[PDB]
């Protein structure tokens, strides 16, 4: 348990709320335009608060353009978005230069337990009567209840959005509303001369007034620095975290289970909730480890220069904990002793550490408020292990704050947290909540308990804490329900009793009906279900009716363009890490495969293979596991293969079976040694022995072995040998074609596969798949419309047949067998030659570009200029590159690729290693495959009735300036926006299309 988790290098920072505001706005804009969010919904408000909390000038210029260019005519939903959007701009402008705010705006829910007819227990959170707002919640809390004695939302949220900046002043505070002889449900306590902590009217008033203002105006945490532990997904810790970030806090959050899953949860919260000035650092951390605690606090306080944060905490919230269930005093062992360390001794060591760091720097006037989770229930349930001992021993910190030398560095605010409902039914004891509330006790949603604890961080109860320790009772009257163990136990009895009797009556009525109606009215009762099969579509573009097409473009355009000289993309395809353009789009856009996605990927990777024949005796027609030949239905494919598909697709560890046995953990190099002492003779043919002689001369002795005809080869003293050795290489990951991919499955033959470099197989499959996206199933159909001299290939590679180069520069050297024509296969122009030689048979142009990482755009550019010169009517266009051992190594010596070992230090996984535009980007991720487009004259596309996926308006290439760095990118493509502005008073009539059409 006590093992170290914490590394500084694993820490992820989230600080870019300036970007997530724009994405939050544009998300809500299209949500409302597609009718997903309505006016009535409470989401448009909770979202609005978050957009206002990130208000800056950039974000108003953004909202203005997006709301002042909606056509309110095109539908009701466009009027809705423009009404709401104008409101949201008015608010955002007021709140500009105002500190952002925690404001819970959730519908307050109470518990409901249902038992139906058949004895099923259902739990549902159920809108309360007379508590529809957060304001109303603080009134309910102040009035206590009978047991605490001592002698425009959801109709028109466009209107409620308007009333978010408008700060609400109240003539009378709710403190006066607190009836005498009644203890409120939320209240602070005061220590009496006897030593006990009693309800204090006065302190409690102050707290509840700050809590009333928070409900109306909201609370800021601008300039608050917070450490929080035990704040994982679906905890009070995590609803506190949302509120801190909501009010612009800077927060360190610690996880015990660091992973992509968790680091994505937290990215998702910052991007929804982090207001302007907020940051979130997520670090892995074991609160059970003394060494992790020392290390964490030293990372928070160290200078950015020494690799730290340079912060100084204003609050510690140490809510980390492990559960111990049915551990009675007989059974206290290792888990409980470890739990006690997490929940008590290492809490003391963490406040000890923040005292030593604050004192080191002589910080005497910026104390950190520690918020300790206390219990009111010390020992009163049992089976809790050492939980009660843990909780009760923190009450020593309310005394030691007076008695030691750390009160200027630290303040204690103990929160006695009460009954907080979890998710549903199983979570907490949700089924008996309703029953406990009937006693006059109040239970809380997690979002209400979050509210109560963010109360303790308001400026008023920060002010008390700094005078004297604050003990907050957020337990809603459970003090006063007597014998709570045996009460709670009676309530669970009564629900179970009722459920069991009801379920026993339900079983017998089924048996004593099954017997009267056999299997006649209990067997013909049951319907027939349709499991969907995969109907994979080509995704040709939807053609609208002509009357709808003439709206989009201006009327002057008819007869104005020369369609012989408009280039149009007519089909496209690819082979890469996610299979085809179809499957890459599903992964790119939705992050998950459809039924059609899964079947295409399973067919590609070779998991499934269609069968139409005899299959273990009977005749069969369908899919079949390619390994076992067992029948498979499309419905079973996700469950059988989706997991296998995702392990062996995409960016992942290099798979040596794919790269000719390349194992980056083990690279064969060779060292040149001189032989000190002569070797043992080995046999060799006459011709091989003469080859050793020709090389070594005096340093080798070759002799006929007179019986056989073979030769002895003594390598003598002073002879050179090469001895192998093995580097461990640090680039372990790559974007590899999905394991299984085989040119055979597409229909390419073994004769072609043996002859040709593997990059050429990616290309052939891309050119076919591209012609099918263009509805050209037989390429020769082109030659009904166009001369054999009018089809071009303007595709290319950065490096070309890079397995063929290994053949002629390494495999020959090692006298391995290599095809005589290996050199032809290495040329960057051979891929195109094979495409002509096997599919097209054109005599049209062939302009193969090399443009390193820009060959594909250069290819388009050449392809267009070849068409607009009237050399070609159609052109294949695109790019291809393979991944091999030699280029991987060389891109590593150039420090261009990400070092995979560094990435593992940072706790990154292969998926999250290509991260463009990101703070922490540290080089690229090598991948392999091909992309092809087919481009034509628009004229010829309309005549052929081929699909038209887009118009290639422009395609350019630029170099940069004088340099001495070949991999350095430049600004030279700026020249596509070159225009003169000396004389920009009056509009050029050459831009007006009406004018241009008049002249025609």
């Amino acid at each position: 348990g006590v093992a170290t988790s914490f590394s500084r290098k694993k820490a992820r920072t989230f600080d870019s709320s300036w970007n997530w505001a724009k994405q939050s706005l544009l998300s809500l804009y299209f949500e409302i335009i597609h009718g997903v969010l309505k006016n009535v919904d409470r989401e448009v408000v909770s979202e609005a608060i978050n957009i206002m909390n990130r208000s800056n000038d950039a974000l108003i210029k953004f909202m203005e353009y997006h709301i002042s260019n909606t056509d309110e005519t095109k539908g009701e939903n466009y009027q809705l978005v423009k009404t709401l959007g104008e409101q949201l701009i008015e608010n955002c402008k007021q709140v500009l230069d105002v500190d952002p705010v925690y404001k819970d705006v959730a519908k307050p829910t109470g518990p409901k337990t249902a038992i139906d007819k058949n004895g099923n227990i259902t739990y549902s959170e159920e809108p309360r009567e007379k508590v529809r707002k957060l304001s109303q919640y603080v009134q309910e809390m102040a009035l206590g209840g009978p047991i605490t004695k001592e002698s425009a939302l959801d109709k028109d949220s466009t209107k409620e959005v308007a009333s978010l900046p408008n700060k609400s002043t109240i003539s009378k505070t709710v403190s006066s509303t607190i009836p005498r002889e009644t203890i409120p449900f939320l209240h602070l306590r005061k220590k009496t001369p006897a030593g006990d902590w009693k309800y204090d009217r006065q302190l409690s008033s102050l707290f509840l007034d700050g809590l009333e203002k928070a409900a109306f105006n909201g609370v800021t945490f601008k300039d608050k620095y917070v450490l929080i532990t035990g704040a994982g997904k679906g905890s009070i810790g995590a609803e506190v975290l949302q509120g801190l970030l909501q009010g612009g806090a800077k927060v360190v959050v610690t996880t015990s289970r660091f992973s992509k899953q968790v680091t994505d949860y937290y990215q998702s919260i910052y991007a929804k909730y982090g207001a302007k000035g907020s940051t979130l650092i997520v670090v892995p951390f074991n609160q059970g480890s003394k060494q992790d605690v020392e290390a964490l606090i030293e990372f928070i306080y160290d200078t950015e220069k020494n690799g730290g944060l340079g912060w100084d905490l204003d609050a510690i919230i140490p809510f980390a904990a492990i559960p111990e269930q049915g551990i009675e005093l007989e059974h206290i062992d290792s888990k409980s002793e470890f739990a006690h360390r997490i929940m008590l001794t290492n809490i003391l060591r963490m406040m000890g550490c923040v005292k030593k760091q604050k004192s080191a720097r002589g910080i005497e006037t910026r104390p950190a408020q520690v918020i300790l989770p206390m219990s009111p229930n010390h020992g009163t349930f049992g089976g809790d292990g050492m939980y009660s001992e843990s909780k009760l021993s923190l009450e020593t910190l309310f005394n030691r704050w007076h008695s030691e030398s750390w009160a200027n560095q630290l303040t204690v605010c103990g929160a006695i947290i009460g009954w907080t409902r979890g998710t549903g039914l199983m979570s907490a004891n949700n089924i008996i909540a309703e029953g406990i509330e009937k006693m006059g006790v109040r239970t809380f949603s997690q979002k209400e308990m979050a509210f109560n604890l963010l109360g303790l961080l308001t400026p008023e109860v920060v002010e008390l804490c700094q005078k004297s320790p604050v003990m907050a009772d957020l337990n809603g009257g459970l003090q006063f329900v007597p014998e709570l163990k045996e009460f709670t136990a009676k309530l669970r009895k009564e629900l179970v009793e009722t459920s069991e009797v009801r379920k026993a009556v339900s079983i017998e009525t089924a048996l004593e009906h099954k017997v009267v109606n056999g299997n006649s009215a209990d067997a013909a009762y049951a319907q027939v279900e349709i499991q969907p099969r995969a109907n994979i579509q080509l995704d040709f573009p939807e053609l609208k009716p002509y009357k709808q097409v003439k709206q989009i473009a201006p009327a002057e355009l008819e007869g104005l363009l020369d369609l012989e000289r408009v280039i149009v993309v007519t089909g496209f395809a690819e082979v890469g890490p996610w299979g085809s353009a179809r499957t890459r789009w599903e992964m790119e856009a939705f992050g998950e495969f459809s039924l059609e996605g899964c079947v295409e990927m399973a067919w590609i990777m070779g998991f499934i293979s269609y069968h139409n024949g005899n299959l273990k005796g009977r005749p069969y027609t369908g899919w079949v596991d390619s390994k076992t030949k067992e029948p498979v239905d499309d419905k079973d494919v996700k469950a059988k293969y989706e997991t296998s598909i995702l392990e062996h697709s995409g960016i992942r560890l290099i798979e040596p079976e794919l790269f000719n046995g390349y194992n980056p953990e083990k690279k064969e190099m060779i060292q040149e040694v001189i032989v000190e002492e002569d070797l043992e003779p080995f046999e060799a043919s006459k011709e091989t022995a003469e080859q050793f002689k020709h090389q070594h001369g005096d340093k080798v002795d070759i002799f006929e072995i007179p019986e056989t005809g073979e030769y002895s080869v003594k390598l003598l003293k002073g002879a050179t040998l090469y001895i192998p050795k093995a580097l461990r290489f640090d680039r372990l990951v790559a974007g590899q074609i999905p394991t299984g991919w085989n040119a055979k499955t597409y229909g390419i033959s073994d004769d072609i596969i043996s002859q040709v470099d593997p990059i050429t197989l990616f290309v052939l499959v891309s050119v076919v798949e591209a012609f099918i996206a263009s509805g050209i199933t037989d390429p020769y159909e082109m030659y009904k419309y166009v001369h054999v001299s009018e089809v071009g290939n303007c595709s290319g590679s950065g490096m070309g047949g890079v397995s063929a180069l290994r053949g002629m520069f390494k495999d020959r050297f090692k006298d391995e067998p290599v095809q005589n024509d290996i050199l032809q296969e290495s040329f960057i122009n051979t891929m195109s030659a094979w495409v002509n030689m096997l599919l097209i048979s054109s005599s049209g142009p062939i302009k193969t570009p090399v443009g390193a990482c820009a060959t594909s755009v250069e290819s388009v550019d050449i392809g267009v200029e070849t068409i607009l010169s009237g050399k070609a009517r159609i052109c294949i266009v695109g790019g291809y590159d393979d991944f091999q051992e030699e280029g991987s190594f060389e891109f590593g010596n150039m420090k261009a690729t990400s070092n995979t070992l560094e990435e593992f230090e940072h706790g990154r996984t292969p998926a999250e290693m290509s991260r463009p535009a990101t703070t922490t980007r540290n080089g690229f991720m090598e991948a392999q495959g091909a992309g092809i487009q087919i481009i034509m004259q628009a004229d010829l596309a309309l005549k052929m009735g081929v699909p038209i996926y887009g118009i290639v308006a422009m395609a350019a290439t630029a170099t940069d300036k004088i340099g001495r760095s070949v991999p350095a990118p430049g600004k030279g493509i700026l020249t596509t926006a070159r225009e003169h502005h000396s004389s920009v008073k009056y509009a050029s009539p050459n831009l007006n299309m009406k004018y241009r059409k008049r002249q025609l």
Binding site: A231, I322, L478
Partner: peptide
Amino acid sequence: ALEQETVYRKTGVDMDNSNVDVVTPNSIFI
């Protein structure tokens, strides 16, 4: 057909309070 019939007869710790929320009195087992 006899060959086909032959072959047919052969076959037929978590310290983050994500699971239990131990900060809360009732999550343990109240």
